[PDB]
Amino acid sequence: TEEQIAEFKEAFSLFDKDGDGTITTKELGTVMRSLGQNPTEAELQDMINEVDADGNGTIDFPEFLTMMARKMKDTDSEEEIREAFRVFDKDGNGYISAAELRHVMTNLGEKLTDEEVDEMIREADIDGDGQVNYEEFVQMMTA
Amino acid sequence: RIDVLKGEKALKASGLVPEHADAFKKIARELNTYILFRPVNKLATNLIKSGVATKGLNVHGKSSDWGPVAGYIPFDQDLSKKHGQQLAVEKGNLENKKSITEHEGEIGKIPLKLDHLRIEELKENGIILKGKKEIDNGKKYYLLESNNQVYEFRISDENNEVQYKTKEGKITVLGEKFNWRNIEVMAKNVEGVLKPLTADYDLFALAPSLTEIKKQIPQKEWDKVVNTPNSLEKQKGVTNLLIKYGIERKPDSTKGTLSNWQKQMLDRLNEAVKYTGYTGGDVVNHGTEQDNEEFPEKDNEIFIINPEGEFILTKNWEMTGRFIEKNITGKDYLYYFNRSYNKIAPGNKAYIEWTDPITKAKINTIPTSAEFIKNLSSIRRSSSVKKIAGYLSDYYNSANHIFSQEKKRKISIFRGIQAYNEIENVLKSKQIAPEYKNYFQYLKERITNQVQLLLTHQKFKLLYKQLNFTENETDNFEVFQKIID
Ligand SMILES: Nc1ccccc1C(=O)O[C@H]1C[C@H](n2cnc3c(N)ncnc32)O[C@@H]1COP(=O)(O)OP(=O)(O)OP(=O)(O)O
Ligand SMILES: [Ca+2]
């Protein structure tokens, strides 16, 4: 959107000791991950190895603002996910708890031992509160 | 205990043809899924029943609820229920003016005819009474009176067409005045002929039982994930199935934005009434309100048929929401509320509030990285350390699931004070924009409650006095370790 396109441009100027929005691929990942991504050293290659045949190895806004202008498609599910989270949060405390995750599961068909479940909360828990908040429930479903 | 209506008194207040609301009990039970309907022009009911074609989504003119044309959809929207208000009665016609041209052939307009029977139906509801006779150039007209001041109507004896004109003295909302002219109603094409349109059954929300959704997922794609060694790639694949098969909806050609179980659940409904006899075709033409994000309507009374065939009727939003909290969203059903509810809808600029749990907590959780940046985005609508954006990208480090809770709490609580620090000195430098200065006074607070929370979960500023801002490495970390014990 206008705002989206107004964001990729925002953070882009957070780290560029060049000034003219002319960054490097050495820091391109530092830009995509800080803004919500986790690409591999390979994904940086093939992509940048098509539009940037300049040989300079530098990047600007118009360039970057078009690359994400593709990936940012099937990923936009953000919504569905957020609505999904709210489905689990049966109590509406803002966090998904074992007891809750149990229901969502048993009622879906897959029964789980009070053990296996408490495992899913822990492998999904990133801050130890023993519960998953949207922020978390997001990573667990994105990265 | 919440003061809602039930059974008969509820159905009556709804608008749905009785036979139909009954036919719906079935499907509500058969699929254990709550059916929630939006109001329905009461003057439309008897029309629906007699078999009038309800209006699809390609027609947006409002139905009238007064005068002789009550129940139908007047072409001159000033005869609609929005009578009297301009920007509305105006944005109305334009809509009609479009349905007639951009759908040439599919939708048209025709003269209103009140047959001998309907007239009575109206004399009963006390909407219009057949008055004295009148002759105009060899034509017998019977006047039709209403308690309305601007317009005056009458009906012909030959073909039963109704006409209206402005009353000597008054002026249309749009500022007009005219003399005797046919009242035109929005019609639809059926077998080459034009048939009038009445209200349609607008669905507020559809919420089925979580199990009912399972049936949707193919017992093949399910197992594939149900049987995954690891646990993580499992939850993801699990949830993602709930998404893909129950939560997600896409735009359809004429049903607006809906999902698939909805398309079926929808279709079953229209069929269900065709069985009782409604010959006018469908009677539910578009997806549920919660998917209407451009022109959201906030109705006081909502009609609810529960999976037990019972009848309810929320007395008002606050309550409509209370009922959805205690019987649907907190009882293991599939439910999602419109995405524009606590935002300004773009279409009509509406601002419909709704209780969103994810936000309630917002205050007690520290911000991710995007939220930070994207907040520096929508923050620069009024109007250099990328460390705070990193420390924030560190806190939610997926590569955290190998450590133990005890561990997690530590590095995080630390990663918090680490981010809460690189923020303190940014403020200790230039008050940049008065409003940015606030955002941070805010984060600093969210950072607190979160950090503090992790500590009380296990063992604030107190500890912020003893620590190294000064050099930089793991050395700073080392001092920390001990402190927590
Ligand atoms: N276009 C303009 C003029 C006036 C008001 C709004 C708009 C109008 O375009 O916006 C419309 C679109 C929207 N809507 C309802 N279910 C939908 C579904 N899930 N998907 C998409 N949209 C849905 O609702 C608005 C009108 O809905 P409708 O169902 O055509 O008539 P309704 O509200 O029942 O009028 P009545 O029967 O009372 O005379
Ligand atoms: Ca919860």
Ligand SMILES: [Ca+2]
């Ligand atoms: Ca957690």
Ligand SMILES: [Yb+3]
């Ligand atoms: Yb409709």
